[PDB]
Amino acid sequence: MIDIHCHILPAMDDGAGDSADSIEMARAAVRQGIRTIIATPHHNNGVYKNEPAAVREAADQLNKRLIKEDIPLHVLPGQEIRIYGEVEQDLAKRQLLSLNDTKYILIEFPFDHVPRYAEQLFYDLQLKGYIPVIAHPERNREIRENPSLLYHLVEKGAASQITSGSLAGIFGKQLKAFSLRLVEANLIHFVASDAHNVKTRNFHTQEALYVLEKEFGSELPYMLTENAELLLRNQTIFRQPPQPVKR
Ligand SMILES: [Fe+3]
Ligand SMILES: [Fe+3]
Numbered sequence: 001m002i003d004i005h006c007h008i009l010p011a012m013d014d015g016a017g018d019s020a021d022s023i024e025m026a027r028a029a030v031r032q033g034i035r036t037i038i039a040t041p042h043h044n045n046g047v048y049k050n051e052p053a054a055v056r057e058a059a060d061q062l063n064k065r066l067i068k069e070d071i072p073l074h075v076l077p078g079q080e081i082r083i084y085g086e087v088e089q090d091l092a093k094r095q096l097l098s099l100n101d102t103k104y105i106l107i108e109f110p111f112d113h114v115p116r117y118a119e120q121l122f123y124d125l126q127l128k129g130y131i132p133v134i135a136h137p138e139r140n141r142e143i144r145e146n147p148s149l150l151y152h153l154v155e156k157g158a159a160s161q162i163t164s165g166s167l168a169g170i171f172g173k174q175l176k177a178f179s180l181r182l183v184e185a186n187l188i189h190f191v192a193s194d195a196h197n198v199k200t201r202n203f204h205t206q207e208a209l210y211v212l213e214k215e216f217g218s219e220l221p222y223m224l225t226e227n228a229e230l231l232l233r234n235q236t237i238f239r240q241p242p243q244p245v246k247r
Contacts, residue, residue, distance in 0.1 A: 001032075001033050001034050001035065001036075001205070001225055001228065002034070002035070002036045002037075002038070002228035002229060002231070002232050003029065003034045003036070003037045003038065003192050003193050003195075003203075003205070003228070004038045004040070004078075004099055004104075004106070004133075004161060004190055004192045004228050004231060005038070005040045005080065005106060005135060005136075005161055005163075005190075005192035005193065005194045006025075006029075006037045006038065006039055006040060006192070006193050006194065006195050007039075007040065007041060007042075007080075007194070007195060007196045008022050008025045008026065008029075008037055008039050008062065008075060008195065009022065009039045009041045009055065009058045009059065009062060009075075010022045010058070010062070012041035012042070012045060012050045012054075012055075012058065013041045013042045013045045013050070014042070014045075014196055015041070015195065015196040015197065015201075016196075016197070019061075019062070019065060021197065021198070022062055022065070023065065023066070023069055023071065024198045025195055025197070025198055025202075025203075026062075026066055026069075026071050026073045026075075027071060028195075028198055028202060028203055029073055029193075029195070029203060029205075030071060030072060030073055032203045032204075032205035032206055033205065033206065034073065034193075034203070034205060035072060035073060035074065036073070036074050036075075036076065036232065037073060037074070037075050037076070038075075038076045038077070038078040038099050038100050038232075039055065039058070039059050039062070039075050039076065039077060039078055040078040040079055040080040040099070040106055041055055041058075041079060041080065042079070042080050042081075042082065043079045043080070043081045043082070043096060043097075044082065050079070051095070052077070052079075052094060052095065052096065052097045055077050055078075055079060055097055056077045059075045059076060059077045062075050063075050076100040076232075077097055077100065077101070078097050078098065078099040078100055078106060079096060079097040079106065080106050080108050080135055081096055081105065081106060081107050081108065082108050082109075082110065083107050083108065083109055083110070083115055083118065083121070085117065085121075087105075087107070087121060087125075088121065088124050088125060088128065091105065091125075091130070092128075098130070099133070099231060100231075100232055100234075102231060102232070102234040103129055103130050103131050103234055104130070104131050104133050104159070104231050104237075105125065105130050105131070105132055105133065106133050106135055106161070107121075107122075107132045107133065107134060107135065108134075108135035108136070109134065109135075109137075109140050109142075109143075111139065111140060111141060112140075112141050112142065113140075113141070113142045114140065114142050114143065114149050114153075118153065119152070119153060119156060122153060122156065122157065122158050123156065123157075126157045131157070131158075131159055131237070132158050132159070133158070133159045133160060133161050133189070133190065134150070134153065134158055134159070134160040134161065135160075135161060135194075136161065136162065136163045136166070136194060137150050137160045137162070137182065137187070137188075138162055138163065138166050138175060138178050138179045138182055139163065139166070139171075139175070144178060147181070147182070147185075147187075147244075147245040147246070147247070148244055148245070148246075150182065150187050150245075151185065151187060151242055151243070151244045151245060154186075154187050154242045155242045159189040159190070159237060159239075160182075160187060160188055160189060160190075161188070161189065161190040161191070161192050162179055162182065162183065162188045162190070162191050162192075163179075163191075163192065163193070163194045164191055164192065164193050164194075164203060164204045164205050164207070164208035165193070165194070165201065165202070165203075165204045165208070166178075166179040166208075167179050167180070167183075167191065167204075167207075167208035167211045167212065168204035168207035168208045168211060169211075170200075170202075170204055176211075180211075180215055181245050182245065183212070183215075183216070183220070184216070184243075184245075185242065185243040185244070185245045186239070186240035186241060186242050186243055187242055187243075187245070188224070189224065189227050189237050189238075189239065190224060190227050190228055190231070190237075191205075191208055191209070191212070191221075191224050191225070192228075193205060209221045209225070212224070223238055223240075226238070
């Protein structure tokens with residue numbers, strides 16, 4: 001399996017602190033059946049930027065260490081990009097990374113609202129042949145209050161990625177209930193760890209898949225999982241008709 005959102009690169013962000021942490025996360029990933037991780041460090045971390053060159057370097061260095069440690073995991077480059085006005089321009093200047101250099105780009109809304117220009121940005125990116133992937137829409141306060149916002153963005157061509165932990169319940173009962181609503185409505189296209197460490201914000205990959213299998217049957221989690229394989233290959237992901245969700 002492929003994990004498309006993960007903070008396994010050390011000293012970049014709020015995920016692994018150092019390379020020893022990265023290695024522990026990698027071992028956990030492997031135990032969960034993950035063979036390939038797209039590292040998605042935040043493009044900004046405080047006062048610092050994690051430029052594309054530095055991300056590629058860090059992924060290359062982590063891969064060398066994983067080989068040294070005999071861990072069967074391959075880390076590919078990417079970024080988690082908090083939305084801002086100049087995403088389309090900065091991408092064209094190669095000052096941002098898409099996921100594994102594919103057409104899929106991981107865009108995160110601030111936790112409290114969906115910026116008003118989001119739809120316009122996403123339209124612009126599609127016209128350039130990108131597919132914006134909304135990070136953890138279930139963790140957004142405004143989508144939670146008004147899920148129709150996600151429905152519309154997805155109807156208009158956006159994809160989204162749910163967090164394994166949300167489905168697994170490790171972030172609470174409420175997040176799980178909401179996540180199942182989004183999945184049912186065909187508004188989710190990927191499941192990913194968003195792992196930051198081994199103990200609290202960890203993978204919960206199999207746990208999430210089991211929840212999906214129990215709730216929807218075997219074919220749905222297969223579809224979500226294969227979507228990560230399609231993404232990796234820069235193929236077009238599979239979608240079901242999006243549906244409004246209420247409340
Ligand atoms: Fe995030
Ligand atoms: Fe993240």
